[PDB]
Amino acid sequence: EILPVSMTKTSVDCTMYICGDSTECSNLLLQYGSFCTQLKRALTGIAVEQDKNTQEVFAQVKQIYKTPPIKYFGGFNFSQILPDPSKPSKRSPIEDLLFNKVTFNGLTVLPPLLTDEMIAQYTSALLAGTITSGWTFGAGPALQIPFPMQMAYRFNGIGVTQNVLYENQKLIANQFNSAIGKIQDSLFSTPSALGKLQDVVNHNAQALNTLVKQLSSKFGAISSVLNDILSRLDPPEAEVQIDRLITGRLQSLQTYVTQQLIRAAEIRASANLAATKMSECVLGQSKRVDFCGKGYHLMSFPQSAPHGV
């Protein structure tokens, strides 16, 4: 299951966008009120909400847990999801495959507060707590327990006694290993798997390209360049043309900001859903039908991804 968690943070400056390096245009913008300050406020609110979403989704553990020297887990391999200490950035192979499949005038893109490695460390700590302690570390101190006993507890939560797991351990382990192996091939072979994550980036890029493209529009004026209009004719007609251009660019900015607000609200809803799914499927076993997967639920493991989980 794949879910977006956040989007890129942007900041826009009014003067460098509209009245580019013109002292005759800055004065004519003061008479239009306080649009710029409230636009900046809205953008800053979106920016801080972006980091709040990630912190809410991922930062759910007080302490960072680390797996012991990897040993026999009853037959389960887990090598494709645990971090590999043999390459930079300390990722997992599936994470590496995920990362390798995802590819101005007055605008600015701000970096996220949390780097990718911190997200990887959160994911590793969550996985270690899940596989060494079980569901107990989500409600207090973590308690150690062997993995087969943990799954014996898991079967007991769906109406199946403990006999089945203990008398069929090897077969279940082999089935789990085969499923894990086939997951990587299924993800790699299918090209249109990470679609929704790419859609967010494509939408943001299209919005930015449209915003920078309309800067060349004449908007029913003499031209689309301030210098030529200024040094060609009388002050009054220059004022009229500058007012026309200012109105057009303000309309464009308003449209962009409203679109960004709507998309941010949608992503906020998605992030809340993702946080709930994490807390209810990873830190415990859920009885809700078709919530943590198709069929009776056993476990769940998270993996980091660009702008999503």
Binding site: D13, T15, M16, K40, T44
Partner: protein, 329 residues
């Protein structure tokens, strides 16, 4: 807390501590700290030659009597141990136009839109050290002088001078109406977040503010390789010329009238350009210029001019009234 933008004296600026003629740069700040009353007032104007009314602001006995007049005494001054008079700095007097009657004497003088605003404040401090603290200046009086003043002096028989700049300030109004504190919006990074937040208290955190831009410095101009040139050696250094009746009409081009070579090769005694300035001739180049070959007498060249008459003007070569060209002999 009101945010306003006007001309003010910047905080922590440079102040000169002391009859020189101090320039009047869009208002000045004056603070006199004396009790002997040596500083009897100020003079304002540009030339003091009966053209601009010398603003004689004199505080003679009790309250300042703003008399807009000019009072030539005799000329030669000297030290005196009554009159207390005889300042002959100026020469000419004229008629009177306006008349008005009514330590740390600090005054602010401003002029805008033909109105002279004088703000005064008199706190009877006992001391000579520069006093720290806040003191607001009230609009004592305004005057519709409607003139221009660029220079001012002080009337003698201990004072500081400052100049004002446009700036944005933050002011605090008391629950009376009194101004108790002010904050600048240019000095320090802190007194910019204070202006942005519109408050005197800032909490812990990171605050967005204005943006920075690296302005340009030099101005490079790179026009294309210059390759073509005006053919003139064949004209202005020829072998033979023609008679007046069989004049040539040589066609020239690639001509920016860029003739500096002729200045050095031929020391032109006569050079008359009846159109645009010869120096500006390099600004625009031409296409269909024609030139003529003449060999004429001495007392005949003056006849080659617009609107002239004579044998040569009437029978050989005639110039138009709107003749745009240069004659060289």
């Amino acid at each position: 807390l009101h945010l306003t933008q006007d001309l003010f004296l910047p905080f922590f600026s440079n102040v000169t501590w002391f009859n020189p003629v101090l320039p009047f740069n869009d208002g000045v700040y004056f603070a006199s700290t004396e009790k002997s009353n040596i500083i009897r007032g100020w003079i304002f104007g540009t030339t003091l030659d009966s053209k601009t009314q010398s603003l004689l602001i004199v505080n003679n006995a009790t309250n300042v009597f703003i008399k807009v007049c000019e009072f030539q005494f005799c000329n030669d001054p000297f030290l005196d141990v009554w009159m207390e008079s005889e300042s002959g700095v100026y020469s000419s007097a004229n008629n009177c136009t306006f008349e008005y009657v009514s330590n740390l004497r600090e005054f602010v003088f401003k002029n805008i839109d033909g109105y002279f605003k004088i703000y005064s404040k008199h706190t009877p401090i006992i001391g000579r050290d520069f006093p720290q603290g806040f003191s607001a200046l009230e609009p004592l009086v305004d005057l519709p002088i409607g003139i221009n003043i660029t220079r001012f002096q002080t009337l003698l028989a201990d004072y500081y001078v400052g100049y004002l700049q446009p700036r944005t300030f933050l002011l605090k109004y008391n629950e009376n109406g009194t101004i108790t504190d002010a904050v600048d919006c240019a000095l320090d990074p802190l007194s910019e977040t204070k202006c942005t937040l519109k408050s005197f208290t800032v909490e812990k955190g990171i605050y967005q503010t204005s943006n920075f831009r690296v302005q340009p410095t030099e101005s490079i101009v790179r026009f294309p390789n210059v390759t073509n040139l005006c053919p003139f050696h064949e004209v202005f250094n020829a072998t033979r010329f023609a008679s007046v009746y069989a004049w040539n009409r040589t066609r020239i081009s690639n001509c920016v009238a860029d003739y500096s070579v002729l200045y050095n090769f031929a020391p032109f005694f006569a050079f008359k350009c009846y159109g645009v300035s010869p120096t500006k001739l390099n600004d625009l180049c031409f296409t269909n210029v024609y030139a003529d070959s003449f060999v004429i007498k001495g007392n005949e060249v003056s006849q080659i001019a617009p609107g002239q008459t004579g044998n040569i003007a009437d029978y050989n070569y005639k110039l138009p009234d709107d003749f745009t060209g240069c004659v060289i002999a």
